[PDB]
Amino acid sequence: NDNPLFKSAMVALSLKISIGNVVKTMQFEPSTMVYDACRMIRERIPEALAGPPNDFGLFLSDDDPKKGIWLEAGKALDYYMLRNGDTMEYRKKQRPLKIRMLDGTVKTIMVDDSKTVTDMLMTICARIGITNHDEYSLVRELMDELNWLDHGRTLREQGVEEHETLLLRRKFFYSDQNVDSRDPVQLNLLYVQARDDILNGSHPVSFDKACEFAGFQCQIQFGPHNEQKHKAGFLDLKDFLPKEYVKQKGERKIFQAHKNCGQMSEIEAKVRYVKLARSLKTYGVSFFLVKEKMKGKNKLVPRLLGITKECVMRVDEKTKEVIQEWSLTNIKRWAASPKSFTLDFGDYQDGYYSVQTTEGEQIAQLIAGYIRIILKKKK
What we know:
This protein is an alpha+beta fold. The chain is built from seven helices and 16 strands. It has helices at about 35-45, 115-125, 185-200, 205-220, 250-260, 265-280, 360-379; strands at about 15-20, 20-30, 55-60, 70, 85-90, 95-100, 105-110, 135-140, 165-170, 285-290, 300-305, 310-315, 320-325, 335, 340-345, 355. It comes from Mus musculus (Mouse).
């Protein structure tokens, strides 16, 4: 017997439609627009009626989740180069995104799953009443160049799946930092942030400075120095010094700084800690370890590259001395790749500054972002 349902494989698309655990194979004219394919799916699969019809769309999955894509409603199925036997998921367009708020709690926000990180950031900010979403960014919370997210790309293509909680993070503003001793709650907040940045290496400091900081830290945690209890071996130095500086010889320098605090109060040590951090040219600067080519040396030289609202700075990796600074005004153009980052200063100097780094895109976007702010104040 013959089959009246049969159509040549060349004139129709035979697609498996997946809705949760249900799968039905369905025949489509290949020029069918995605919106109309959803209508025909609602006419054949009862689980397609599980909500308002415009809440659902079509998603092309992939064994590599980073390659899954949402289909656009106005496009024809054959635009997506589908083949007989391919599967498309009939999926809710909005999905929950778990976000750590600025108070440390996690809030689940529904976002358009086809959109970029910037789009979902705007949705988040709209839900919690933030109008200036440009003061914020989303970051991962992995145990690190790995937590950065390109806001012009999607979470999906950057390897962030739906289970992952992201952090809403306020960008650094010097204007956020005005200190005070009458507000101990705020003073503690400023102290914890300055301390954590130094201990975790975000704020690179010299060995001598690291031990002065640790001396105030000792005053704050232990009270005035007491030679009976605060003796050799007492400190767990990993909690008082940046990782690069965790060396026994640091303890005696820390105890000297601690002793020099005398009977200074907890509040006043916090003030001094914050004041010392804010006094450094490295304070507030976003740093990247990059590899420099020195004239007359084959081995590349690691260097700290710092970006701020007004300049780019080269900082010695070991002493943290500021070696060179370029005003953002005197950069002609910049370029980033997955392996390098290069600056062109026009006629301000001969030769480009070109360094090896896997964070070039991060660096480029910081510079462009700060330059955009300077642009927006003049106009």
